[PDB]
Design a protein around this ligand. Structure first.
Ligand SMILES: Nc1ncnc2c1ncn2[C@@H]1O[C@H](COP(=O)(O)OP(=O)(O)NP(=O)(O)O)[C@@H](O)[C@H]1O
Ligand SMILES: Nc1ncnc2c1ncn2[C@@H]1O[C@H](COP(=O)(O)OP(=O)(O)NP(=O)(O)O)[C@@H](O)[C@H]1O
Ligand SMILES: O=C(Nc1nccs1)[C@@H](c1cc(F)ccc1O)N1Cc2ccccc2C1=O
Ligand SMILES: O=C(Nc1nccs1)[C@@H](c1cc(F)ccc1O)N1Cc2ccccc2C1=O
Ligand SMILES: [Mg+2]
Ligand SMILES: [Mg+2]
Lengths: 280, 288
């Protein structure tokens, strides 16, 4: 219904964008038959036709902060088509802007990721791979969650490392690590520590260090996501409220040098961005 | 208002040339948001002739940057260089004239009538905003997707699209726009034929007073051609209103094969919901 079955003669892979746990992402072109136009798309080639049933679920998501699977091609290697995000993922974005971000942008991203994760919770889809690399930037003012519903030890809750149980509260943990990535401008969590040892350091009660720009107010939220008791860590609905609260007074909760001249887009610039690449 | 972004050079680059018109050349361009590594496709119209003049160009730019309708194009930005350059969204399918030419006979009756409805909706919106188009023609109707057209280059010599009272006097009205709307419909129904082909433009004024109009397109039933002819009546106030045209064409679009006789109209692909959602998610996320 909302998933278009494509045939191989309708799209072309052009450039490789990256590789992850399961799949390689290409920049591609959609070639509508009978037409002379070439529309850019993102294609994930993976590494059971029932997969069609899985595809229908991701084609059925409806939220401004959740990516939708647009099409699939099954003739050979399973290929999936979704809208291409020219800004790439949020992780690469925040690294390349380590010097010019701003508290207003950072806190709003936390709101948007929480909104998307709450939507997935309402639909009872567990992400199982939330991380800054799986948050796509449509525009700098608008981020979207991807590759949900399907090796990454440093984002997994303790109950996911020891036992293989992924819950919405396990997603809350990975949400906490995702915020940490943003607040550290794309730092690698537990840098230098082998993944084999992360299981053990968490039971000793060691967490990720406090980001230098974070007040304790925001750091308490992050740490609250990493509590060993899954049912005691925050709910996504609460995260929306807290971060939305902080976004109404951003300089009070994030201490960034020069935070006054690198703030939210002007309405003229917002209208220009929106008419050009974000009309939803 | 203040929906017009004043762009500076070095923020956009002209890449490919798309065409030239009465005053200006349109390029495919790239917007490079400052501080970013991204290349956003745009359409750029560089005018033809280069002070104080750009204060009225700016005043119109603010007006055209403020239109809000699904079937009316919006001016997005302007660059105030020697030659003024204008920025709007790039329509990769191009104008409706070239589209209907490259799909001659390959178009279904359902498509043709829907375009007439949408152009009328947009032209009625411009009337609601008290803006005279002054240049309605199939070349100034852009195809966003095949199911969605938008009006452009409004509110600013094309003798064969002008009402008689515009040729013999520079009087452009919403009712004179109704005339060019009729000529535009004729273009669509003839799959992009040239209007009054073979008659010199200097002589068009005289043939209209003698009562000669554009011929009936072979695919048009008598009902569709009668609307067209009412658009070209010498009495301006006797021509249809745009909202009446919306109602009329909407009625015919609910039974297109009753009003358009097209060979193979049963083998002519119609818009399927799966294809609609795919087109919209990729290039038409706007409300409609
Ligand atoms: N729709 C898209 N548009 C643009 N770039 C994309 C898109 N999807 C993915 N990418 C890029 O492709 C990279 C790799 O894709 P992916 O296969 O998801 O690996 P990953 O997400 O980074 N790691 P993993 O969580 O294990 O999949 C991402 O980091 C993005 O930079
Ligand atoms: N936004 C756009 N996206 C894509 N193609 C466009 C766009 N605007 C204009 N074009 C193309 O550029 C061509 C030339 O533009 P233009 O200068 O307006 O000439 P024209 O509209 O054909 N004649 P006229 O408008 O009466 O002066 C058009 O015919 C279209 O094919
Ligand atoms: O395709 C995906 N991502 C892509 N990156 C570049 C192009 S597509 C990914 C996905 C996309 C989306 F919009 C929303 C949630 C997701 O989980 N999916 C979907 C799916 C269905 C059946 C089997 C495997 C996968 C799979 O891996
Ligand atoms: O810019 C236009 N067309 C373009 N084609 C390719 C890129 S822009 C055109 C226009 C665009 C639109 F979205 C809606 C209505 C319009 O009248 N305008 C606007 C304007 C303002 C001041 C002086 C001259 C012009 C002028 O020519
Ligand atoms: Mg991924
Ligand atoms: Mg034009």
């Amino acid at each position: 219904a909302l998933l278009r079955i494509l045939k191989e003669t309708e799209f072309k892979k052009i450039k490789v964008l990256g590789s992850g746990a399961f799949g390689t992402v290409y920049k591609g072109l959609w070639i509508p038959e009978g037409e002379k136009v070439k529309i850019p798309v993102a294609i994930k080639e993976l590494r059971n036709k029932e997969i069609l049933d899985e595809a229908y679920v991701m084609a059925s998501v409806d939220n401004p902060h959740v990516c939708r699977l647009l099409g699939i091609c099954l003739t050979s290697t399973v290929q999936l088509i979704m809208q291409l995000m020219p800004f790439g993922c949020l992780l690469d974005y925040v690294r390349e802007h380590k010097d010019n971000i701003g508290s207003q942008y950072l806190l709003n991203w936390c709101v948007q990721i929480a909104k998307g994760m709450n939507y997935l919770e309402d639909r009872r889809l567990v992400h199982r791979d939330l991380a800054a690399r799986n948050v796509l930037v449509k525009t700098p003012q608008h981020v979207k969650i991807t590759d949900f519903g399907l090796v990454p030890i440093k984002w997994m809750a303790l109950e996911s490392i020891l036992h293989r149980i992924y819950t919405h509260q396990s997603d809350v943990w990975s949400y906490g690590v995702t915020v940490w990535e943003l607040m550290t401008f794309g730092s690698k969590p537990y840098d230098g520590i082998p993944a084999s040892e992360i299981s053990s350091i968490l039971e000793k009660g060691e967490r990720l260090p406090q980001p230098p720009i974070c007040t304790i107010d925001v750091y308490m939220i992050m740490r609250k996501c990493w509590m060993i008791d899954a049912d005691s860590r925050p709910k996504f609905r609460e995260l929306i409220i807290e971060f939305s609260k902080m976004a109404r007074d951003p300089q009070r909760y994030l201490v960034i040098q020069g935070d006054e001249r690198m703030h939210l887009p002007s309405p003229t610039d917002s209208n220009f961005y929106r008419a050009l690449m974000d009309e939803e």
